[PDB]
C-alpha cells in the first residue's frame, strides 16, 4: 500500500531557472560565512537535505523529500531536527526570491549546493517535488539514534533502501561539520576546521587514537587527541568488519568516495518519487567558481 508521488516540474521552469536558485544559495553561503564559528551554513544545509529526505519509509512511501513537510510544526519540532531551524532560516530569503520552487525542491537543492560549493562531488539533481498538506507530515522518530551499534545502523538504513556501501558513503558527510551539545547531546567536530568536502571522515576513523569518553551531556562519544569526535554509530563502522572494509576503501580512494557519495546522496534525495518517462534529465549545476562568479 505505497503512496505514489509523481514529480511535476514547476511550470515553465528549466535548468537555467534552477541554476539561478543554486547561485542564490551559493552566493548567500559565501556571504553569511561567520555562522557556527566561521564554518558557514554548508553543513547545516546538508543535514537539512538529509533529514527532510531520511524520514522516508520504503514500505508505504510515507515521509521522504517529496512533500517538503519540514515546513510544518510537527516535523520542524522533531528533537532529531534540533538546530536545523538555522538552515530553514538561511533558506527563507531564497524561497522569498524564488517563490515558485517547491519546499522539497529547495530543501534538497540546499544540500546539493552546499556539497558542491564545498568542492565535493557534483550531485545530479532533479526538480518536481510538490508540496503536500500538513496531515502528510511524518511522525517524529524516523531519524536515527546516535548511541547505537553497527546492527542498528544496518537495520535502520534498510528502511531507506540503503545497503552497506551506501550507508558508509553517506556517513562520510560527517567530515563537514560538528555536533553541538545543545542540539544533540554530543559535542565537537568529526575532523579539521576546513571549508572543503573530503574523505577525512574515513581517514580520521582509521588514523586517530580514539578514547570512549562521556561528554557534558552524560553521553558516550569517541574522542581523539586532535579534538575530533565520533558518534557510537560512526565508530560502529570500524567495529563491524563489513563496514570496516568500505571505510578503508574510501580512506584510500577520494575519487571512489566522491562518486559513491554523489550516487547515494542523489538516491537519498530522490527516494519515494516517481519521475515520468518524459521528465527532464537530472541537472548538474555549475559552482560559482566554475561560472567565474
Ligand atoms: C546513523 C546515521 C546518523 C546519525 C546517528 C547522525 C547523527 C548526527 C548528529 C547527532 C549530528 C549533530 C547534530 C547537532 O548537534 O547539530 C549530526 C550532524 C550532521 N549530520 Fe549526521 N547522522 C547520521 C547520518 C548522516 C547522513 C546520512 C548525513 C548526510 C549524508 C549526515 C549529515 C550530517 C551533517 C553535514 C552534520 C553536521 C551538521 C552541522 O555541522 O550543523 N548524517 N548527525
Ligand atoms: C514554506 O516556505 C519555505 C520553504 C523552504 C525554505 C524556506 C521557506 O521559507
Curated annotation (Swiss-Prot):
Record site: Transition state stabilizer: 47
Keyword Heme among UniProt keywords: yes
An example Gene Ontology biological process: cellular response to oxidative stress
Cofactor: heme b
Main location: mitochondrion
Electron transport among keywords: no
PTM description: CCP1 precursor is processed by the rhomboid protease PCP1, which cleaves the N-terminal hydrophobic transit peptide. The m-AAA protease (composed of YTA12/RCA1 and YTA10/AFG3) is required for CCP1 maturation: m-AAA protease promotes membrane dislocation of the CCP1 transmembrane segment within the transit peptide to ensure the correct positioning of CCP1 within the membrane bilayer, allowing intramembrane cleavage by PCP1.
Post-translational modification Phosphotyrosine, affected residues: 152
Enzyme Commission number(s) of this protein: 1.11.1.5
Binding site for heme b: 174
Molecular functions per Gene Ontology: cytochrome-c peroxidase activity; heme binding; metal ion binding; peroxidase activity
GO cellular component: mitochondrial intermembrane space; mitochondrial matrix; mitochondrion
Enzyme class (EC, first level): oxidoreductase
Location of the protein in the cell: Mitochondrion matrix; Mitochondrion intermembrane space
Cofactor note: Binds 1 heme b (iron(II)-protoporphyrin IX) group per subunit.
Active site: 51 (proton acceptor), 190 (tryptophan radical intermediate)
Note: Present with 6730 molecules/cell in log phase SD medium.
Function: Destroys radicals which are normally produced within the cells and which are toxic to biological systems.
Family: Belongs to the peroxidase family. Cytochrome c peroxidase subfamily.
Subunit structure of this chain's protein: Forms a one-to-one complex with cytochrome c.
Protein name: Cytochrome c peroxidase, mitochondrial
Gene label: CCP1
Stretch of the intact protein here: 69 to 361 of 361
Amino acid at each position: 500500500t505505497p503512496l505514489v508521488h509523481v514529480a511535476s516540474v514547476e511550470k515553465g521552469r528549466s535548468y537555467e531557472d534552477f541554476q539561478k536558485v543554486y547561485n542564490a544559495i551559493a552566493l548567500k553561503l559565501r556571504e553569511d560565512d561567520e555562522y557556527d564559528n566561521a564554518i558557514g551554513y554548508g553543513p547545516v544545509l546538508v543535514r537539512l537535505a538529509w533529514h527532510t529526505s531520511g524520514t522516508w519509509d520504503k514500505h508505504d512511501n510515507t515521509g521522504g523529500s517529496y512533500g517538503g513537510t519540514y515546513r510544518f510544526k510537527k516535523e520542524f519540532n522533531d528533537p532529531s531536527n534540533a538546530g536545523l531551524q538555522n538552515g530553514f532560516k538561511f533558506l527563507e530569503p531564497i524561497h522569498k526570491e524564488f517563490p515558485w520552487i517547491s519546499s522539497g525542491d529547495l530543501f534538497s537543492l540546499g544540500g546539493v549546493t552546499a556539497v558542491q560549493e564545498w568542492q565535493g562531488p557534483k550531485i545530479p539533481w532533479r526538480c518536481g517535488r510538490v508540496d503536500t498538506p500538513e496531515d502528510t507530515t511524518p511522525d517524529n522518530g524516523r531519524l536515527p539514534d546516535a548511541d547505537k551499534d553497527a546492527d542498528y545502523v544496518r537495520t535502520f538504513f534498510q528502511r531507506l533502501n540503503m545497503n552497506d556501501r551506501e550507508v558508509v558513503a553517506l556517513m562520510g558527510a560527517h567530515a563537514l561539520g560538528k555536533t553541538h551539545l545543545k542540539n544533540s547531546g554530543y559535542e565537537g567536530p568529526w575532523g579539521a576546521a576546513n571549508n572543503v568536502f573530503t574523505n577525512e571522515f574515513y581517514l580520521n576513523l582509521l588514523n586517530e587514537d580514539w578514547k570512549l569518553e562521556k561528554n557534558d551531556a552524560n553521553n558516550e562519544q569517541w574522542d581523539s587527541k586532535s579534538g575530533y569526535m565520533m558518534l557510537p554509530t560512526d565508530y560502529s563502522l570500524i567495529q563491524d568488519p563489513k563496514y570496516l572494509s568500505i571505510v578503508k576503501e574510501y580512506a584510500n580512494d577520494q575519487d571512489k568516495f566522491f562518486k559513491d557519495f554523489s550516487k547515494a546522496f542523489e538516491k537519498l534525495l530522490e527516494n519515494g518519487i516517481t519521475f515520468p518517462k518524459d521528465a527532464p534529465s537530472p541537472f548538474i549545476f555549475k559552482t560559482l567558481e566554475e561560472q567565474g562568479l
